[PDB]
Structure formats: structure tokens, C-alpha cells
């Protein structure tokens, strides 16, 4: 043989009245479609084979042709939106959902895989898969006392497909669907397989990527301690989605943010804020910026965990996108912090790295930094210490950056700049 058939040969066999012949041609098509160098997906579609493949899904007496067409349709569905649409238009969604019940584990797994590709196209196909009733049979495949008695590759594929049912926005998944899936997802979040664990974190990060009501659905399931545990893992494919989920959560209410602090997340941040992977430092700092946007007692938690020197470090040397988050973290800190907390920030050395970033061409970061300066001067005014801080910004060259920015293109930048000049500078 079934290796390297022409498409016209495949058509001839599928159009024969002979189920065995059809099986040989379907396998041939599967082998064409499973080659890494540009599989002929459009050719297979243009030959009108998808309806015949979908009808083979229902041939319970010929499980080999069920598997071969399932695999063939899987790889078509893995293509572009137009190619996934052709699989959907051929009626494949109900047929795959029926296959979830097959007594042949490799066939139900293939159905699981295919639905994951269809659902992975976007919210519309995701919700169509849900409306056809995929969730109940998928979850029933995972209704065992001990997950570790399932085949590793089977369990990984189910986790990945479930994570696609949690993915995408505009709109987010149906509330009923999320709430039906969550308990199984919480169980997978405690499984020992690193790939199951990564995809479960990814699913949780999707569900926490939204309004506070969505964050609350997840947090109410008690998964935040497990997220913090996974946050400390050595495997970066696990840390990345774990940090994403934590960062999502601390964009919600102050009470939801507090659960992350209570679970111990801040103790991991010395390593996260120096992590050699650029994306980890960026999203660790982004997470910090939304904690320092919180309550003064939560800012005080950041101080107590020794994280202000780590913010000074990121602000001093990091990828610029990480430095921008660090600028945000500081402006949030200085917006809500106490005078004593703001003084502590200055004593840790925030001024000079904050000045140096006034050379960046990013207009938003200059605004963010200039706003932090006002907040910090405001604290010095409640102490008569403005003069001593004015000198600090001068003594490290900050006022060259400020007394120049008064002639900037942006109006809000020019206004804050000459204001800082006239009031102190």
C-alpha cells in the first residue's frame, strides 16, 4: 503493498464494490497522508474521498478500515481551516463521537485525536464538537480508579483533546462545558506523566484567561497549590503553562491573588525572575506587576519575600520586553504602596536603572517610568525629602533624560516631563 499509490489508484480502489479493496486503498491513502514531506491533502480532498472515508468510520464489521479512515481523516483535519472544514462538512463529527465507544482502544484513541484536531481549529468547531455531545464519552474514557492503568499515549491524547475543548476565546467555551470538564482536568493535574501535566496546565491557563468569574470557577476547585507545586518543576514544558495560569489568576480580584500568595508562589520567584529562558522571566515579571497592583499587605508580601532586589535586577538587565514588565511592576508598586514601602524601593537601588530606561524608544515605557517618578516624588514630599531625591536623579544622569523628554513627540510625555522639571528642578 500500500506504499506510494497514486491518488487515482486510491480512487479506483475506494470506488470498487469490494470492502477488502476499499481497505487496501484507504490504507494507501493513510500512508500518503502520514508522510512528512507535503502530504497531498488537497489532492485527496479534490478527489471527493472524504465522504467515503467518513462512511468507513461506521463499518463496525471491518475495524481495520475504521482505523485507517480514522487516521486518514485525522491527518486531513490537522491541516488548514479549509481542510478541517472539509472533514467537518463530510459529517465526520458525529461519526468520530460514535467511535469513542469502540471496543478497540486504538480506534477510540484515533477518534479522540481527530476530535482534538477539529476542536483545535477555533471556537466555532470547538463548540460544534461540544454540541454533538463529545464531552460525555470523552470523560467516560477517563472514568477509572487509577489513571496510570491507561496506556500512556492514549492518556496523553485524551488530555490534549480535552485541553483543546478548553482553548480559545471570542467566545470562551460554554460555562456548562467548562464546569463538566474541570473535575477530570483537576485529576489529570495530579498525574505523574510530564506531558499529561503540561497539557493540563495549558488547559487551566486557557480557563483562567478571561474575566474574574472564569478565574473563580478554577480557583474554587482548589488547584492553586498544585499549580504552585508545578511552578517549581524542573521540566520547562511544565513550568511555562503553570506560570501562565498563575499569572492569569493574579489578574483577577485581590482575593484570588491572595490565594496564589497563600499557596507559596512568591518563594519560587527568585529563580523565576533569573530564569535563563527569556519567556519565563518576562511572564514572571508580568505576574509580579499584577501582584504589586494589589493591596498594601500584598505589596508587603513582595517585600518580605526579598523580591524587590530581584525587580531591581530585572530592571537593570533583561530582555527589553521583560524590562517593560519590570517598569509596570514598579509603577504599580509606587501607586498603591505606603511611604515606607516606597522608601524601601529607593534604598534597594531602583532609581538609576529606572533612569537608564528613559533612553528607550518605546513611548509607553517612558510614560510608565515617568509616572513612577511622580509617585516616588509624592512619597518624598510627605517627608520633606524631595531635595535629597532630586539630587539622586541628577547625580546619576536622570535629569538629562527628563529635561530632554520635555521636547518629546508624545504630549503626555512632554507634559509629565516639564512638570517634573517645574515642581522639583
Amino acid at each position: 503493498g500500500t506504499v506510494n499509490w497514486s491518488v487515482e489508484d486510491i480512487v479506483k480502489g475506494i470506488n470498487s464494490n469490494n470492502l477488502e479493496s476499499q481497505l487496501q486503498a484507504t490504507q494507501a491513502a493513510r500512508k500518503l497522508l502520514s508522510r512528512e514531506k507535503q502530504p497531498p491533502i488537497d489532492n485527496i480532498i479534490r478527489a471527493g474521498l472524504i465522504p467515503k472515508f467518513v462512511s468507513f468510520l461506521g463499518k463496525t464489521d471491518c475495524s481495520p478500515i475504521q482505523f485507517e479512515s480514522a487516521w486518514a481523516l485525522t491527518n486531513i483535519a490537522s491541516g488548514t481551516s479549509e481542510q478541517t472544514k472539509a472533514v467537518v462538512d463530510g459529517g465526520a463529527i458525529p461519526a468520530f463521537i460514535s467511535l469513542l465507544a469502540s471496543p478497540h482502544a486504538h480506534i477510540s484513541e484515533q477518534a479522540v485525536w481527530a476530535l482534538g484536531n477539529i476542536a483545535g481549529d477555533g471556537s466555532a468547531f470547538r463548540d460544534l464538537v461540544i454540541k454533538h455531545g463529545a464531552i460525555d464519552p470523552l470523560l467516560a474514557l477517563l472514568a477509572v480508579p487509577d489513571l496510570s492503568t491507561l496506556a500512556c499515549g492514549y492518556l496523553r491524547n485524551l488530555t490534549w483533546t480535552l485541553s483543546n475543548l478548553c482553548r480559545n476565546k471570542n467566545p470562551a467555551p460554554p460555562l456548562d462545558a467548562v464546569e463538566q470538564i474541570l473535575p477530570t482536568l483537576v485529576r489529570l493535574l495530579h498525574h505523574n506523566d510530564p506531558e499529561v501535566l503540561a497539557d493540563s496546565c495549558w488547559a487551566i491557563s486557557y480557563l483562567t484567561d478571561g474575566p474574574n468569574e472564569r478565574i473563580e470557577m478554577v480557583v474554587k476547585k482548589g488547584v492553586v497549590p498544585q499549580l504552585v507545586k508545578l511552578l517549581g518543576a524542573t521540566e520547562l514544558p511544565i513550568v511555562t503553562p503553570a506560570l501562565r495560569a498563575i499569572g492569569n489568576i493574579v489578574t483577577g480580584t485581590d482575593e484570588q491573588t491572595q490565594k496564589v500568595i497563600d499557596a507559596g508562589a512568591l518563594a519560587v520567584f527568585p529563580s523565576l525572575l533569573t530564569n535563563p529562558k527569556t519567556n519565563i522571566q518576562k511572564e514572571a515579571t508580568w505576574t509580579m506587576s499584577n501582584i504589586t497592583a494589589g493591596r498594601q499587605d500584598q505589596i508587603q508580601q513582595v517585600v518580605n519575600h526579598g523580591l524587590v532586589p530581584f525587580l531591581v535586577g530585572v530592571l537593570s538587565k533583561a530582555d527589553f520586553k521583560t524590562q517593560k514588565e519590570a517598569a509596570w511592576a514598579i509603577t504599580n508598586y509606587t501607586s498603591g504602596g505606603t511611604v515606607e514601602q516606597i522608601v524601601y524601593l529607593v534604598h534597594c537601588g531602583i532609581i538609576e536603572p529606572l533612569m537608564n530606561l528613559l533612553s528607550a524608544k518605546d513611548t509607553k515605557i517612558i510614560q510608565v517610568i515617568l509616572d513612577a517618578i511622580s509617585n516616588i516624588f509624592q512619597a518624598a514630599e510627605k517627608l520633606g525629602e524631595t531635595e535629597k531625591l532630586s539630587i539622586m536623579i541628577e547625580e546619576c544622569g536622570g535629569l538629562d533624560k527628563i529635561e530632554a523628554l520635555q521636547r518629546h513627540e508624545n504630549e503626555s510625555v512632554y507634559k509629565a516631563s516639564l512638570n517634573l522639571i517645574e515642581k522639583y528642578f
Partner: peptide, 8 residues
């Protein structure tokens, strides 16, 4: 992570 993936 991958939205879609073929079987190889």
C-alpha cells in the same frame, strides 16, 4: 502548544 497535529 499545537492547535492541531498529524499522526506520523
Amino acid at each position: 502548544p499545537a492547535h492541531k497535529k498529524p499522526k506520523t
